[PDB]
């Protein structure tokens, strides 16, 4: 009964890093939503305005370690992007129907975890409205991908993964386990989830766990196959990721 | 060698986290210092101008979880601040000779660790030069405090602290170790350091470590005096905190 706590801090440590890596990101849209140059662009856009920003956002994505940062207009169209030089440049796409647009518009801020339309590449989409006098002038967006955290967490050998409240493995030190489940889903909500995750493909097959028995703590004994590794005795702890509505779980070996 | 692995990783983690927390703040001056309304406010000390900038910084700092974000003009007087409504408002205060001001003028930027000059709140002061034409118009400063990271650390059960290159502890899981040192310092270089921490009471003695064996690991066993007592034995690891000039040392028990 001695791994319990040890794994329990290991987990609080993981959640914690993940809090901070999300917050690191969140600042970008935060400063950018008020930015006079961002603002300028949206009232009176012209070719040099939008170029300055394309670069301002290019340098920022680099320094912020963001996958993509892009500015969307009032209509839902992307106007400037970090990836503007890429063939995958998001400049000109229609995001009007994405929740990170519409929720940023309704609320001032929004965050939604999804699969890039073309990238098939998982991310937390973070957003903020840009206020106009009059009213909304557009939305700014930053995409956090989490290969860095995941490669941190592989580096422990307590494997770990993060679920949203529907029980869905969004972020994982074990690639294969991305998008499986902790909780039972039923008929009704299977296709709808696909939808929002932009991964109609998704398995929603449950992580290969047998012999779940809840030790007093709400920590659990556990038999897992890993990618490897036919079968394996293990310990499961949980923690809430502060600043998010995600859950973290760490399996400790024996 | 069993503790070494365990502690090598945990410390690596502890840095990464520190990295994410520092980096969260780095971005605000990064952007603030280029923001036309930052500029205007410094070239047009208007009162609408300063009005706005005040809650602008209030809002950003609150979200940012920066402890204070404030804006100094060329003469060093601070002109708008997150905290314009607490009695501890930095507004009208002279910071003309603080290094964070002075070096951001001479160099473009500066990060400087020091005690709150009225608070006794230790923190990083992350500063950026507002250029104009004709030369610099002022500096924008975001102060990062470390109480949250110190509390994540208290929780881990492996005391850890960060030293600059001077050998001084700045961030520490054990509060009474603040401004204790790795290397002895000499009598008359105390003055200038106390003068720069903005803390004449900086104890600046060597950490109370004894009986150090350096390993083949380049980890080291040591005996430490625990605040209160007793002296427990510890394994010590070292890692550079990535993208700072800071260094983290972490003690794990036996
Ligand atoms: Ca969330
Ligand atoms: Ca540094």
From Swiss-Prot, chains A, B:
Residues 1-254 are periplasmic. Autophosphorylated. It is found in: Cell inner membrane. Coiled coil: none annotated. Member of the two-component regulatory system DctB/DctD involved in the transport of C4-dicarboxylates. DctB functions as a membrane-associated protein kinase that phosphorylates DctD in response to environmental signals. This is C4-dicarboxylate transport sensor protein DctB. The lineage of its organism: Bacteria, Pseudomonadati, Pseudomonadota, Alphaproteobacteria, Hyphomicrobiales. The gene is dctB. The chain holds residues 55 to 308 of 621 of the full protein.
């Amino acid at each position: 009964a001695g791994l319990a706590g040890q794994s329990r801090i290991d987990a609080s440590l993981k959640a914690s890093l993940l809090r901070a890596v999300v917050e690191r990101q969140r600042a970008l849209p935060l400063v950018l939503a008020d930015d006079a140059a961002i603002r300028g662009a949206l009232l009176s856009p012209d070719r040099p305005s939008l170029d300055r920003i394309n670069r301002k956002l290019e340098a920022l994505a680099t320094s912020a370690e963001a996958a993509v940062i892009y500015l969307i207009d009032r209509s839902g169209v992307a106007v400037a992007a970090s990836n503007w030089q890429e063939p995958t440049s998001f400049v000109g796409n229609d995001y009007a129907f994405r929740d990170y647009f519409r929720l940023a518009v309704r609320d001032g801020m929004a965050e939604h975890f999804a699969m890039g339309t073309v990238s098939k590449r998982p991310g937390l989409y973070i957003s903020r409205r840009v206020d106009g006098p009059g009213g909304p002038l557009g939305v700014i967006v930053a995409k956090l991908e989490f290969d860095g955290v995941e490669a941190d967490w592989q580096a422990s050998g307590k494997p770990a993964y993060v679920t949203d409240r529907r029980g869905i493995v969004l972020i994982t030190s074990l690639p294969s386990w991305r998008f499986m489940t902790t909780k039972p889903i039923a008929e009704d909500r299977l296709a709808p989830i696909r939808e929002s995750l932009q991964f109609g493909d998704a398995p929603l097959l449950p992580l290969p766990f047998r012999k779940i028995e809840a030790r007093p703590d709400g920590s659990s004994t556990l038999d897992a196959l890993l990618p490897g590794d036919s079968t394996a005795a293990f310990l499961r702890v949980e923690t809430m990721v502060p600043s998010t509505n995600w859950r973290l779980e760490q399996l400790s070996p024996l």
